[PDB]
Amino acid sequence: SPGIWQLDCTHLEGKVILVAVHVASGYIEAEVIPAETGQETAYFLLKLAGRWPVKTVHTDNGSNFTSTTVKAACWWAGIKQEFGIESMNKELKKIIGQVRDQAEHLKTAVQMAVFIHNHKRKGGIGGYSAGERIVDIIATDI
Amino acid sequence: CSPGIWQLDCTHLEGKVILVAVHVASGYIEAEVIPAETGQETAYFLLKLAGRWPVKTVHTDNGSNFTSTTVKAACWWAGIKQEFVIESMNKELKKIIGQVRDQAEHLKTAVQMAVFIHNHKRKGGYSAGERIVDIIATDIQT
Ligand SMILES: Nc1nc2ccc(F)cc2s1
């Protein structure tokens, strides 16, 4: 189902990175957040939901994800939370390692890695990148 | 017009700076309150945008944040041509901001609520969110 996303917090360089994956496509969005809090998580989720048609979000029982602020954002946006990507975290961290030297700050490196992940040609022919896939899948669904 | 073209501009509200991106072919928008009207903040926003959508060309005015070499380096890295609608989009967005404000103390949150309403709810029978995905998918498929 094209409305399903997984969200998770992972950790690198002593910082927190919130990762969202579109399950059907493998498309990713990620951002370094100042602290592993409900407030930061809710803002991230609200931005995500204004951009893609988000219906259900699967997370673990981490305190940021079970927070009242996240519950409120999901309620406002009409998102169903399921409690309850690890390979995605691994792939994202791998790409981060590949570009890390091209930025001073991890926050910039993370966005470079998202770009690379979503846009890189897969299987030796155009049209099968994560970013091309999510667009095709969502368009076909509507 | 080409599905890879976006316009970016800054607008102001309550003494804060709001960076706005419009996908020209669809009317879809992304916006965020940014800490300062700087090249660094603009470049970060643009890198995130470019990691999410296939951005080929960005139109802006000659504001110092848009002409900065940090924005230029981001465009180089991401393969984006800079060229030096949004007017009305700014007014539209501000109107919605007032309408969602009841669940948003901070303008930061309000802005994202308004983007959500603009892209998903307004149908003026497709939403801008449906249109962008259909325009881009059709481009990919051809
Ligand atoms: N490596 C790690 N860094 C942080 C930073 C914050 C936090 F809450 C948990 C962790 S685990």
Instruction: Taking each helix axis as running N to C, give the angle between helix B39-52 and helix A106-119, from 0 to 180 degrees, rounded to the nearest 10.
Output: 30
Q: What is the CATH number of the domain that holds B115?
A: 3.30.420.10
Are the C-beta atoms of A54 and A77 separated by less than 8 Å?
yes
In angstroms, the first-to-last Cα distance of chain A is 12
Q: How many domains does chain A have?
A: 1
Q: Which residues of B are less than 8 Å from A72 in CB distance? A: 103
Secondary structure (DSSP) of B55-122: --EEE----HHHHSHHHHHHHHHHT-EEE--HHHHHHHHHHHHHHHGGG-SSHHHHHHHHHHIIIII-
Q: Which residues share a beta bridge with B100?
A: none
Name the A residues in 111-140 with CB < 8 Å from any B CB. 111-112, 114-115, 118-119, 127, 131-132, 135-136, 138-140
* Domain containing residue A135: 1-142
Distance of CA A27 to the CA centre of its chain: 8
- Which residues are A9's β-sheet partners? A18
Report the C-alpha gap between B9 and B63 in whole angstroms.
9
| Closest partner CB to B140 (pick from A52, A53, A135) | A135
DSSP string, A9-70: EEEETTEEEEEEEETTT--EEEEEESSS-HHHHHHHHHHHHHHS---EEE--S-TTTSSHHH
Residue B40's CB is within 10 A of a number of other CB atoms, namely: 17
For residues B99 and B81, what is the distance between their CA atoms, to the nearest angstrom? 36
Q: For residue A6, give the nearest of A32, A14, B65, A24 by alpha carbon.
A: A24
Structure-solving method:
X-ray
PDB resolution in Å: 1.9
Amino acid at B15: G
B47 exposure class (CB count in 10 Å sphere: 0-12, 13-18, 19+):
buried
> Closest Cα to atom 3, ligand 1: which residue?
A14
Q: List the one residue out of B87, A52, B81 whose CA is nearest residue B71.
A: B81
